Amino acid sequence: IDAFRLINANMMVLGHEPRQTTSNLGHLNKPSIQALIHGLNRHYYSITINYRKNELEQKMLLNLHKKSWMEGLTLQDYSEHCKHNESVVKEMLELAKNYNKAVEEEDKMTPEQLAIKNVGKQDPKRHLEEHVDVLMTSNIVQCLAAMLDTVVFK
């Protein structure tokens, strides 16, 4: 979203956008190549727009959009839950075997240049601990929610 404002054609000998006592004009947008081709800055000029945020609007928008009462204590029953802890182990194993394959390999002729011209961004620690972190956090949330309801409900 952007708004604009027309400048007159009489100011041809004076530079447009008569800025005087401001230094925020370098902020909030700079005029891109797709903007300065049609009318900027010789016809119209750009303008800055801020957002009138306050109380009595902002917290009540969050508490009715991103908020759930009954959902924060459910259990996502273990037919598909422990099933999800099985398809991820296999692809992590193959990545571990692939991680095994590179670590035992160990090219030791010009190592620092061979390492920097041959990156993969998926072998060393990209696909190794990403899913491992995800499976760790999920069962912790699931078991802790399972333990709490056993403490509460009798």
Partner 1 sequence: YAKKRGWVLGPNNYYSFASQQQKPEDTTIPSTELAKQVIEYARQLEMIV
Q: Which stretches of the chain bind partner 1, using CB under 8 A? A: 136-137, 140, 143-144, 147-148, 150-151
Residue that the structure tokens 């908020």 belong to = 67
Nearer CB in complex with partner 1: 5/154:
154
- Residues 28 and 37: their CA atoms lie apart, in Å, by 20
Nearest distance from C-beta of residue 148 to partner 1, angstroms:
6
Nearer CB in complex with partner 1: 17/149:
149
> Would you report the helix, strand and coil content of the chain in percent, each value rounded to 5?
45, 5, 55
Nearest distance from C-beta of residue 97 to partner 1, angstroms:
26
Nearer CB in complex with partner 1: 82/144:
144
Nearest distance from C-beta of residue 153 to partner 1, angstroms:
11
- Residues 4 and 46: their CA atoms lie apart, in Å, by 5
Token pair in block for residue 6:
């027309």
